Amino acid sequence: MLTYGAPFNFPRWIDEHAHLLKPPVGNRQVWQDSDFIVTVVGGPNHRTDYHDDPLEEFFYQLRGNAYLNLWVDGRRERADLKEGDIFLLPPHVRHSPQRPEAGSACLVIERQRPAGMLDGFEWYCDACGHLVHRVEVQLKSIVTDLPPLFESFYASEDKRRCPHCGQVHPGRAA
Ligand SMILES: O=C(O)c1ccccc1O
Ligand SMILES: [Fe+3]
Ligand SMILES: [Fe+3]
Structure with a gap:
């Protein structure tokens, strides 16, 4: 069976959930219980922490602009996700994603982490x-x-x- 359903329109799926892709909530998983963790992340949302992911994260800024504060070779760097941009973050790199813009949308992909x-x-x-x-x-x-x-x-x-x-x-x- 089609466990994750069949295809659907993405633009107007986002629009439907726009009320959840703005804080207090801030984001939204598309499918549940799947190896690929697929979420849209919307602004506005600033945060203070750094994620260290043991695998890769894929970004694609569908709407608005955003950015990642990073840690690189010892310095603090920044990745810009202007609209349209894609980027593949390697594992264990330290990132703090800032989504200033109200009603920005960014597709973010990642894998369910396995035990250990x-x-x-x-x-x-x-x-x-x-x-x-x-x-x-x-x-x-x-x-x-x-x-x-x-x-x-x-x-x-x-x-x-x-x-x-x-x-x-x-x-x-x-
Ligand atoms: O926990 C994550 O992989 C993550 C997801 C979306 C935005 C920033 C992140 O660090
Ligand atoms: Fe992360
Ligand atoms: Fe100090």
Whole structure:
């Protein structure tokens, strides 16, 4: 059987869900329970953390512009996803995706991680640039598995304390 259904129009699928592709929600998986994790990610959404994925992530900016703050060779870099752009992020590269624009849409693809394989999340000192905080996590369900992790850091002056210049990372925004 056609487990994931049959083809459907994508433009007008996005439009239908536009109400979920703007915070508090922010994103939307297309199919459930599939090896390819396929999501549309919409703005506005800024975030403070860095994902460390053990596999690859594929981006394709269908609508609006966005960007990825990165960590490269020691410096902090930036990838621009102006509209129309595609990009393939290699594994373990550290990325913080900023979607300033209201009603931007970006297709993001990735693979269900198999048991044994954990993702890291990481925040860095704004000032001394040392790693403030890191959690590794067997990512099973984006929904259930991920917000709580963010709260524990965001609601604790203690974790946000840099183990170098003792400066307290903001957690909320910038
Ligand atoms: O957890 C992810 O792979 C991810 C998904 C969408 C946007 C940014 C990301 O780091
Ligand atoms: Fe990621
Ligand atoms: Fe610091």
